[PDB]
RNA sequence: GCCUUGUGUUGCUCAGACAUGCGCCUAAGGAGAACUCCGAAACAAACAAAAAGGUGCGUGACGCACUCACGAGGGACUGCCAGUGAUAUACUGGAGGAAGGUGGGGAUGACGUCAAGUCCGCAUGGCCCUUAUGGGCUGGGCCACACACGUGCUACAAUGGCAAUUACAAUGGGAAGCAAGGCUGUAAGGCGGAGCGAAUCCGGAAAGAUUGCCUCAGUUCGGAUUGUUCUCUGCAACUCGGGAACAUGAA
């Protein structure tokens, strides 16, 4: 497994001097170290956002997305594309929060598109954008978990379906970074927590309902869902309905994998002796909870094609009319700067690269990112 | 060029099999189709969401076209009357959906008269009046 | 023009086993000429009175068809219509297809309107 | 764990290892999992809630030892009624109107017996 | 040139590699199933494609050191067999190269039951360095070669 | 409905009107369904050659006549 | 398993339908349920799927 | 709504209406009928 | 139409309709051969057949179609053989025999 | 297999245009200052059409450019060039072309040989039977089972098995029939019938691709054998039919 030490070597080497950073027409490659991720302008694109890795994971701790890893592992850089789509979107959600002193920005916005072409990184950088304005924002980077796996009971009020490991595992990876502002936070309705049926362990003994204190925190709620199996379903609804109480910070909720909340679901009913029948995903609870966006609370909803769901209506239920949006492939310019950072990466060698050359493979993977990226290291 | 005289036009289709041989019965000379334009007879909304609920698949929405076949009879003219039998008696019942309108509108309008604090003291004493 | 006779009209369906175009002389005049597919039902038969399997000889039976289309008036199907039952045509049988339009008597349900 | 009658392997998953009970195949394996709500875990990592909920769903269907019996015990009165049946099941040949002339050889035996000493 | 249309449009390849990567392709397919070997062959290529270097030439130089120079035949005189050595021309090295490789590749694939692209490229990798399973087939066909060659004469084609 | 086959079962026509006095003769009809009505009686059922002489028991209720007389000698080879 | 007729390629061989193949309402009776639809609405769908 | 109630009671009373205009052989509960088996010909004569 | 790249196959986009990259490959094959690869904008509409059939009769059509655009890129295509209908077809299964050329197997003792 | 020419409905209708029907999701009240207003209402309605916006499925008018269907033809002949050769017949290469040398495939099968096969398809010379070797019915057998051989189907698996999603055909068949949608049953089935004697109406192609599970096991490989519960055809499924459900799980 010597393959990899010429490349190493090169690319540690590259780095000594700058002269080498120039992108499409000669223009500087990267960003300034000065600018952050609040602070892009129009004149930014077409230019590569430096990370660092730590502090990526540190700014997003419920997990790093499979295209920016599959970007990662393959560039070996951290470093993501600039582009004209996500700042635009963030120009929206920042119309939203704060008006300023024809467009009429959109609270609630759904990301459909071509497959592989970035909305999960897109959603990623705007989930980083956020909680870097230290937003209260809720990331689901993979909505496929709250539907697939674990135990499921049906509720013996509602007639819905509790999951409690997932129930659980939302509550950890919201307060993995949300405890120092849900510290600060306070509950604005103090009715009674019904209790529900543990995971595995079925239903508590004596406990029905668990009261909550005068002076309880949303972190002491979120702490009870944790340590108690009989109550995560009730403090996820109830986290849910907290959270559009809330006035002191803005608040956000993104989800990725929103087209699987509208099919089945693993789970399976026996409703007859010698059957079966499916459930719905919107039969669960903590899907139940968070699927509608007949709201006023900020929520981003992106599909994902690499999941089999299938074929939707273009009329969702419990969607607005006009809450989809299109997220477009590579343009020819965007494709010339990822072409010259693969080049500066070293994916491709220097003496067969050229403008008809790469010029070929973004007309025959048609602006994919996967497809581009799989493809340059052939050419010749 | 249209027929003489006035009102909807119907629109007749109709086969005879020149059999060789001196045998003349052939199983396509007993079927007759008729067509009509649903909008030219002139029916209120109601009464052509009726008509349409009692047709099913015989009405054709891109070219408003109603068409009736008849084979179930031995002779071409009995399914040609069978036709506008079933023609007429298809008009006759999908008329009726103004008197179902009428009731219901009536209906929801007396029960919004129920719950009014103002229309029931004249009620009461116009029945007390005449007791 | 060269769009579809569409009103009162004759449509006449030549079916045969020969080409009608061998004997043109025959057919009626008309106004437009089309023609459908041809199709073809397939029979293999055994050779031998005994057992002989691997030989066989395949025969056909194949049947081709004609449409024709004839423009003409409402008062004049009557006077056609004579003509049109009896004529011959060589190896073929004809399906006469017709296209009127009446109209519609409304006051026995006009009631209900 | 013992279920049923028969042993259930602690490291296989529950849907391969409840198929173990004389009764029970792939599709009562997968009715018996939806009614305890369960997806697939592995057999040691059951609770015993969990447990006597399997023993009373897997309850539910004629299983194990009696299931056997009963078998055993409905093969045995065709026997003694005496049917074209029983008599096949008695000279152990096929009672379902397969050929005996060449392919008997699951009720037979295998070729063992052998040339049949003369043309 | 319906074999490897990925790397016929990205062209800049002559006959012989254009004929090498055919056969790389073609040589183990079942059934006329190509997707799941195409995908193998071009996943092997890609492992040091992302790495610099010109992994065609690689394959030119890997087959290059297996394409056997002589074999043998079996050929009946007087009733005994004797094992007449013979030349093996340019397409015959090419494809015995090939399909021992590809036969190499697959028994450690079995014996070590690993991912394919990795069977594949371990063999390709070690061919390149004058050792492996192919290069002691070539010198063992060379061992048989030359000890019968004095029983050259007997050849008839 | 109770019924847990909705077709009748099938006996011939000469037993239909007579029922259990029919019931201890010769018989040709193997293809009738044996009644819980014909317990306890003697009949004689054809097997092709012969006569078979059979005993409706219990055990007999619901199968056919022909069920218990063999057509087909059981062959011992040399 | 081609001969297995409790799968569905040896439902398939057989030329026969059951729970393992199923007819065209099951596909029917599944695409309404997965859409949210009542199961009375007439087939082709009156909606766009996209 | 009025909408829903003055388009959803309009349609009603349809299934008897229908089987009385065009013929039809109504059977509600899917009993075993004899009308699929006298709704064909008699081929006897062919024969 | 000369344009700037897109491509429909039956109203849906291509990548959509082929979403191997072979198919795709030698569908751009011949503007690749020809140097016009960018300036076009491409509708067809297909059917019949299977995949690779499909592949190459849009192939064959996008190779006329240049052809009748231009008629100097012949020499370019005609060494690539983009203009050459391959008349290959399914052969007919002949009587007494399992297949177009393959037999029973034969018993000779 | 390629190209002309003529005909264009049940077939095609691409781009660029004109007009239209039906179903949805919203919120919407008549009159004199640029129909606006300042006029009427108690309560939400959108009603006889008209009156707004997002849309989904289509149709007509113009055509028949294009695909396709059909009728008639063209084109490929060593025709042309160079060489080898015996200036012949040919052989080896090239140009042009959709196709190059027999373009692919079918049909077509000499004199006679095997006293080849068929008297149980049929017709026939000779012999033979005639209360029977002739004619009818019921029931059985041609499906037996120590064994041997031939032709096939399914497999012994990871280039794979299974579930979910998603694509792409051709030949044919349909009145003793094919049967869309809908209801009912776990299922085979059951009820009922939009259209169609059919370029018009009627039956999810599978391998394939995407995601996930299985991880080398006699297995989530393979489905023989067997039990119970049913169903279809039929006067009738015991010997001796097809199919379903659950279980059993050989080699
Ligand atoms: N701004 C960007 N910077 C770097 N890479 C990008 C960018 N946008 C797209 N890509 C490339 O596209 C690939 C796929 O991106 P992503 O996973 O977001 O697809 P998607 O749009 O979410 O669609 P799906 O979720 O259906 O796959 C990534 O591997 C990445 O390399
Ligand atoms: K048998
Ligand atoms: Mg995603
Ligand atoms: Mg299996
Ligand atoms: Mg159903
Ligand atoms: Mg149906
Ligand atoms: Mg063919
Ligand atoms: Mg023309
Ligand atoms: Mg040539
Ligand atoms: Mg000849
Ligand atoms: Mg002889
Ligand atoms: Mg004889
Ligand atoms: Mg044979
Ligand atoms: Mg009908
Ligand atoms: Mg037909
Ligand atoms: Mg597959
Ligand atoms: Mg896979
Ligand atoms: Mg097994
Ligand atoms: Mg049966």
Redo the contacts between chains.
């Keep these: 497994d010597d393959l990899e030490a010429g490349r190493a070597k090169r690319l540690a080497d590259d780095e000594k001097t700058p002269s080498l950073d120039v992108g499409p027409n000669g223009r500087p490659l990267f960003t300034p170290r000065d600018v952050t991720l609040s602070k892009l302008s129009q004149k930014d694109i077409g230019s590569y956002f430096n990370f660092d890795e730590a502090a990526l994971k540190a700014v997003l701790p419920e997990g790093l997305a499979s295209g920016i890893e599959d970007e990662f592992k393959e560039s070996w850089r951290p470093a993501l594309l600039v582009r004209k789509s996500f700042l635009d979107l963030r120009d929206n959600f920042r119309r939203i929060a704060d008006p300023p002193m024809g467009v009429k920005p959109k609270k609630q916005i759904i990301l459909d598109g071509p497959v592989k072409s970035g909305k999960s990184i897109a959603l990623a950088m705007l989930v980083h954008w956020a909680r870097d304005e230290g937003w209260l924002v809720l990331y689901a980077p993979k909505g496929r978990d709250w539907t697939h796996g674990g135990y499921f009971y049906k509720n013996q009020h509602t007639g819905f379906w509790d999951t409690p490991l997932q129930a659980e595992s939302i509550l950890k990876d919201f307060v993995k970074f949300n405890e120092p502002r849900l510290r600060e936070l306070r509950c604005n309705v103090y009715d009674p927590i019904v209790l529900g049926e543990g995971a595995g362990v079925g239903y508590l003994k004596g406990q029905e309902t668990m009261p909550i204190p005068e002076d309880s925190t949303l972190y002491d709620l979120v702490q009870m869902g944790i340590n108690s199996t009989h109550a995560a379903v009730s403090v996820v609804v109830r986290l849910r309905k907290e959270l559009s109480l809330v006035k002191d910070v803005p608040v956000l909720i993104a989800i990725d994998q929103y087209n699987n909340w509208?099919?089945?679901s693993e789970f399976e009913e026996p409703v007859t002796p010698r059957s079966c029948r499916?459930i719905?995903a919107?039969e669960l609870t903590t899907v139940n909870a968070f699927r509608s966006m007949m709201h006023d609370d900020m929520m981003v909803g992106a599909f994902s094609h690499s999941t089999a769901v299938?074929?939707?209506?273009?009329?969702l239920?419990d969607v607005p009319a006009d809450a989809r949006q299109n997220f477009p492939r590579y343009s020819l310019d965007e494709a010339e700067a990822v072409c010259y950072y693969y080049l500066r990466q070293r994916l491709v060698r220097r003496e067969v690269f050229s403008e008809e050359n790469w010029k070929k493979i973004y007309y025959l993977a048609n602006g994919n990112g996967a497809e581009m990226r799989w493809l340059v290291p052939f050419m010749r | 060029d249209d027929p003489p005289g006035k009102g909807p036009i119907l629109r007749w289709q109709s086969r005879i099999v020149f059999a060789p041989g001196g045998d003349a019965w052939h199983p396509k000379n007993r079927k007759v189709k008729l067509s009509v334009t649903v909008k030219e007879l002139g029916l209120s909304k109601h009464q052509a969401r009726r008509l349409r609920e009692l047709v099913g698949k015989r009405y054709d929405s891109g070219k408003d076209e109603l068409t009736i076949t008849s084979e179930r009879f031995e002779h071409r003219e009995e399914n040609r009357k069978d036709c506008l039998r079933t023609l007429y008696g298809l008009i006759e019942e999908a008329a009726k959906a103004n008197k179902i309108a009428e009731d219901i509108r009536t209906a929801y309008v007396k029960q919004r008269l129920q719950a009014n604090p103002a229309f029931m003291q004249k009620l009461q004493a116009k029945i007390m009046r005449s007791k | 023009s060269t769009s579809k006779i569409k009103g009162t009209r004759i449509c006449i369906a030549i079916r045969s086993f020969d080409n009608p175009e061998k004997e043109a002389w025959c057919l009626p005049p008309h106004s437009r000429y089309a023609a459908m597919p041809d199709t073809r039902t397939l029979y293999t038969v055994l050779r031998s009175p005994h057992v002989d399997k691997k030989s066989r000889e395949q025969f056909e039976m194949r049947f081709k068809k004609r449409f024709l289309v004839i423009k003409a008036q409402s008062h004049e199907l009557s006077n056609k219509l004579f003509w049109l039952k009896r004529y011959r045509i060589l190896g073929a049988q004809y399906e006469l297809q017709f296209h009127c339009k009446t109209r519609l008597d409304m006051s026995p349900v006009l009631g209900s309107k | 764990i013992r279920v049923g009658n028969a042993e259930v392997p602690n490291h296989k998953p529950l849907k391969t290892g409840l198929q173990e009970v004389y009764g029970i195949g792939?599709?009562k394996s997968h009715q018996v999992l939806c009614g305890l709500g369960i997806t697939n875990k592995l057999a040691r990592d059951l609770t015993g809630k969990e447990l006597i909920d399997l023993r009373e769903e897997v309850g539910m269907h004629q299983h194990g030892d009696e299931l056997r019996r009963r078998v055993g015990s409905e093969i045995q009165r065709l026997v003694e009624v005496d049917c074209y049946r029983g008599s096949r099941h008695r000279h152990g040949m096929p009672c379902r109107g397969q050929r005996t002339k060449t392919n008997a050889r699951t009720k037979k035996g295998k070729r063992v017996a052998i040339a049949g000493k003369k043309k | 040139x319906x074999x490897x249309x990925x790397x016929x449009x990205x062209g800049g390849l002559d006959g012989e590699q254009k004929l090498l990567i055919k056969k790389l392709v073609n040589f183990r397919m079942k059934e006329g199933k190509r997707t799941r070997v195409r995908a193998i062959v071009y996943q092997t290529f890609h492992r040091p494609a992302r790495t610099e270097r010109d992994v065609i030439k690689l394959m030119v130089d890997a087959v290059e050191n297996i394409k056997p120079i002589c074999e043998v035949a079996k050929v009946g005189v007087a009733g005994t067999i004797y094992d007449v050595p013979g030349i093996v021309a340019r397409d015959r090295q090419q494809t015995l190269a090939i399909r021992w490789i590809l036969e190499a590749a697959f028994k450690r694939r079995i014996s070590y039951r690993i991912s394919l692209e990795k069977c594949s490229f371990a063999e390709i990798l070690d061919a390149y360095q004058k050792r492996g399973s192919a290069r002691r087939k070539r010198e063992n066909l060379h061992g048989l070669a030359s000890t019968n060659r004095s029983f050259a004469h007997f050849r008839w084609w | 409905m109770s019924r847990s086959v909705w077709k009748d079962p099938f006996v011939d026509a000469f037993l239909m009107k007579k029922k259990n006095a029919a019931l201890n003769r010769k018989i040709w009809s193997r293809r009738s369904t044996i009644l819980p009505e014909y317990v306890d009686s003697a009949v004689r059922i054809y097997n092709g050659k012969t006569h078979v002489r059979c005993k409706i028991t219990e055990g007999k209720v619901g199968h056919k006549f022909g069920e218990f007389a063999f057509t087909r000698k059981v062959k011992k080879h040399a | 398993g081609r001969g297995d007729s409790?799968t569905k390629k040896g439902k398939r061989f057989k030329g026969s339908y059951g729970?393992s193949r199923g007819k065209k309402q099951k596909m029917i009776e599944?695409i309404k349920?997965?859409?949210?639809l009542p199961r009375s609405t007439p087939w082709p769908l009156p909606?766009?799927?996209? | 709504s009025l909408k829903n109630l003055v388009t959803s009671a309009v349609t009603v009373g349809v299934t008897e209406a229908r089987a009385r205009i065009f013929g039809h052989m109504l059977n509600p509960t899917g009993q075993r009928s004899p009308h699929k088996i006298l709704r064909k010909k008699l081929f006897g004569d062919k024969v | 139409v000369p344009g700037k790249g897109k491509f429909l196959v039956n109203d849906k986009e291509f990548d959509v309709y082929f979403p191997m990259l072979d198919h795709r490959a030698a569908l751009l094959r011949p503007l690749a051969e020809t140097k016009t690869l960018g300036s076009w904008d491409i509708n067809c509409t297909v059917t019949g057949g299977g995949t690779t059939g499909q592949v190459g009769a849009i192939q064959l059509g996008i190779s006329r179609a240049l052809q009748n655009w231009e008629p100097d890129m012949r020499t370019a295509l005609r060494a690539a053989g983009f203009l050459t209908r391959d008349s290959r077809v399914v052969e007919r299964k002949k009587p007494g025999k399992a297949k177009a050329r393959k037999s029973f197997q034969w018993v000779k003792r």
């Design positions: 509208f099919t089945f499916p719905h919107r299938g074929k939707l209506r273009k009329d239920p | 792939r599709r | 409790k729970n599944r349920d997965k859409l949210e909606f766009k799927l996209i």
